[PDB]
Structure 1
Amino acid sequence: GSWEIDPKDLTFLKELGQFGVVKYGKWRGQYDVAIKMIKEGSMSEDEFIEEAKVMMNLSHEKLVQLYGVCTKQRPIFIITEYMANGCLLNYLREMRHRFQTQQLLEMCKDVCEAMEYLESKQFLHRDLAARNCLVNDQGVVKVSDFGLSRYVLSKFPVRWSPPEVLMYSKFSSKSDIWAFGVLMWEIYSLGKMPYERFTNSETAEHIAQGLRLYRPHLASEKVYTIMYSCWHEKADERPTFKILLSNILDVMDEES
């Protein structure tokens, strides 16, 4: 299989972190990889295997590169590039990095470039959040687990969902745009949980009454305008990822 990796070619070396376990390893004793082993029973494997073919064709510098899958096993393995600094959410929470706001904005831009590419290929992420982004050895943020929620068999991403998703299950590019605004908020808040005082239940009720996430102190007024634009009540009034990207570039230039 063009999408098919022989598990014999994989050496397991260290552990890295519901879906199952990830391990760091080498392919042909030579190439760094991460190996997510899918917990048996947790996933719709045949559907996933068909989708993997499409995912295999997705290629972008800011998207985590899939190398293949091990099918014909139990559990299946998903093989990607190794991202040394692990998940974005944890990275943000390590206060030792002492990020400059220019570094936070670059994280936003990395993700927005990935999401712009997905949007140009009509591919919906469907669970975009800092927990599902990864960070490489150079501090580059990349989008991970794209589309994966479709195959997983009170744990729903309420805090990253627009009102039409919460009320009617209307997913669209514009529900990814909402989630992206919430990811900018996570970044500027250095990894706080969105609506940090509320339960999921309260968050839904508050979103329906028009509540929005407050401006994190590290966000400039112009950066807040951007994430705020992602949360219009009317989906059609939210920007595209292409517009978000140009806005993020403008701010980078103005706040250089």
Structure 2
Amino acid sequence: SVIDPSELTFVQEIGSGQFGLVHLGYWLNKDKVAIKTIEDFIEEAEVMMKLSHPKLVQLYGVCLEQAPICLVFEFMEHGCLSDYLRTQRGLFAAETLLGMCLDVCEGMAYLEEACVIHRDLAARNCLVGENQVIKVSDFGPVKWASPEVFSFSRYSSKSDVWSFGVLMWEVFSEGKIPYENRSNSEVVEDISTGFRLYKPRLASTHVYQIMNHCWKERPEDRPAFSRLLRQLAEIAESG
């Protein structure tokens, strides 16, 4: 990786060793970024900056000089996970797909520890980066919602766990639509009666046990993200 001189600006000398005269300098980098378009949200920005984790799409800064207000995010080379899964359908190995769920779970456990509620955990809100890394984004509809969320809008990290079980299904079914030909009213009726998304072929019986655990009616009966992280980390390293 060669650096063109134009990109470099020398400032001052910062001491000297025997093999190398050191200089403090400014490096002008032309890095790719993703820019989201729109006191009000100024307070939300400085907080999102503190939320730094390798499995979360990083916020770099905000642009406030009038016109549409910008938000500078980390660029994710391969786009959204939902589209990524759909185009490579029938091409994935079960180990690749468990690795994607572990990636999401790592970021979610950090958000749980930080006391941050996602409210929209779905494959479409997750992004694919370098070496098939999955990072969580859009942290600040019924298909992913738990009974307390669709019925009363009672958000908690345990409702994010319900959403995560739906995500795991999307991943293991290689980006299929949950409750495909059902309406938002039909879905509510189905879950309430006790219906659950079927076991996809690429998901082992143990992975499907985890999915149903995320889908228990009582939020207090669902595992925490910290519990899920240890669980999926063991299945990944053992096989």
- TM-score (structure 1 length as normaliser): 0.80
Partner of 1:19 in structure 2?
none
Tell me which of 106, 112, 135 is aligned to 2:128. Answer: 135
1:179 corresponds to 2:172: no
Partner of 1:36 in structure 2?
36
Tell me which of 194, 213, 225 is aligned to 2:197. Answer: 213
Check the 8 A contact 1:49/1:71 in 2, yes or no.
no
Tell me which of 59, 63, 68 is aligned to 1:70. Answer: 63
Partners in 2 of 1:134 and 1:48 — Cα distance? 24
Alignment of 1:6-85 (within 5 A): 30-38=30-38, 46-85=39-78
Q: Provide structure 2 residue ranges, at least 5 long, that are not aligned to the other structure.
A: 1-27
SS in 2 for 1:215: coil
Q: Tell me which amino acid in the other structure corresponds to 1:92.
A: L
For these two proteins, the number of residue pairs brought into alignment is: 213
Cα shift readout 1:63-84 (whole Å, capped 9, x = no counterpart): 0111011113221111111101
4+ runs of 1 displaced by more than 4 Å? none
SS in 2 for 1:75: coil
Cα shift readout 1:167-208 (whole Å, capped 9, x = no counterpart): 111111111010001000000011111111211121111111
Change (3 A) 1:214 1:97: closer
Alignment of 1:61-210 (within 5 A): 61-95=54-88, 98-147=91-140, 157-210=141-194
Of stretches 66-75 and 213-222 in structure 1, the one that deviates more from structure 2 is 66-75
Partner of 2:220 in structure 1?
236
Query: Root-mean-square deviation (CA), in Å?
Result: 1.6
TM-superposed deviation, 1:29: 5.4
Percent identity of the aligned residues?
56
Check the 8 A contact 2:166/2:211 in 1, yes or no.
yes
Q: Provide structure 1 residue ranges, at least 5 long, that are not aligned to the other structure.
A: 1-27, 39-45, 148-156
Q: Tell me which amino acid in the other structure corresponds to 1:203.
A: V
Partners in 1 of 2:213 and 2:226 — Cα distance? 13
